[PDB]
Amino acid sequence: QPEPDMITIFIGTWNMGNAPPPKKITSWFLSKGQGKTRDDSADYIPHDIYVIGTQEDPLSEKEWLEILKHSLQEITSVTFKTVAIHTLWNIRIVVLAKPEHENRISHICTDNVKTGIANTLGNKGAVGVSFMFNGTSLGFVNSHLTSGSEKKLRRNQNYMNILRFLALGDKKLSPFNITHRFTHLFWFGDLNYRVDLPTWEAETIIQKIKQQQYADLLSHDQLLTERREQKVFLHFEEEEITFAPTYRFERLTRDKYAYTKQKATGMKYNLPSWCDRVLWKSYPLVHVVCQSYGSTSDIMTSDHSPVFATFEAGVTSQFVSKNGPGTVDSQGQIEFLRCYATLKTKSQTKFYLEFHSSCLESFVKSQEGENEEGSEGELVVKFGETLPKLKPIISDPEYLLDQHILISIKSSDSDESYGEGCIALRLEATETQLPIYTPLTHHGELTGHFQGEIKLQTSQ
């Protein structure tokens, strides 16, 4: 029975509007409706992993698990195993997997973050799940961010609080937040970003939707505009949107958008918006391909339509050699040449690096770099040829070239990370000096750059 080198992952996000679902929701799991939809010929082919995010979910965990499992069984005739379920208030995440994956899945983590203070603490936040699938780390975040057209800044703050404080993945990766802990990170939910056009344009917007002319609407979508100005979701991807806005519908039809201000909306307009989204971030040069991104047309119990996205994702096997794990392989080494960090910080402390990777027995601390002034004000931290030689646990190129090195630059004074990034070992050549580069972030905001050269020795 060979270990897979690809799996398919289903991501679902649905704000259920505090209403039970209808008796049939199979269209969701089948990626059928509007947008980038799945070929009919694939309908019986199960995804390897189904991750279901709900918001405003009125069901017990038991009630929803029964509906989900019975839905997948009707579609595929496969009885899926429950990997994890985690609920914060009415925000829920369910991970189901094919039974053949039960012994490939380990290190299952769940967490939640509550966003806001006092007034704004009580129903918004995120839940998440992580685990290993053989040699590949997977993370999944379902967030319900602050509502309202005039609160995009609050949403961006919610995002930063969730990525700082959601405790998923390998706790030994202490300088790194969830945006660096996983081979593949999927972040979805009712992100609540709106189409930011004048209220008076509501009927014009509806007209455009009926014509399936989304271009002039997406150019005003707050998530796309905020992403373009690097205010939120820096270094995350989203598939092109080719489905109608998923909010706000009259219930029991999809023929009408309910946008007008009502006591029930706190006298706020809800212009048709793409509230319900799926984004991802994968380590550099790892295969990840979106194969569907769309909304259902036939599930109408909520004022939101369900959104689906499916992905092909590269995975690696749990590698054993004669040597590692449990020793080094002297035939392998990672050298860094002519490296320097460029930092936006106005501080003057000394900095050192930490190298973290599951190809090392444990993380490696460098010597302090040498601080110089950049020609445009910047701090440049030079490491020269001083950086340690990294000693991987396995030298086999079929293992090593699939690995990644996480880099933190830390203050000698405080031991706090000023920047985090990631370098792929999927090089064009071994035993050859090649350029490397990573942006550096902290709390998911750009704080600098790391660049230099790498020289990788494998057993071949």
Ligand SMILES: C1CN(CC2CCOCC2)CCN1
């Ligand atoms: C793909 C997407 N890119 C920028 C997007 C920002 C928001 O709107 C769409 C473009 C980041 C890197 N490459």
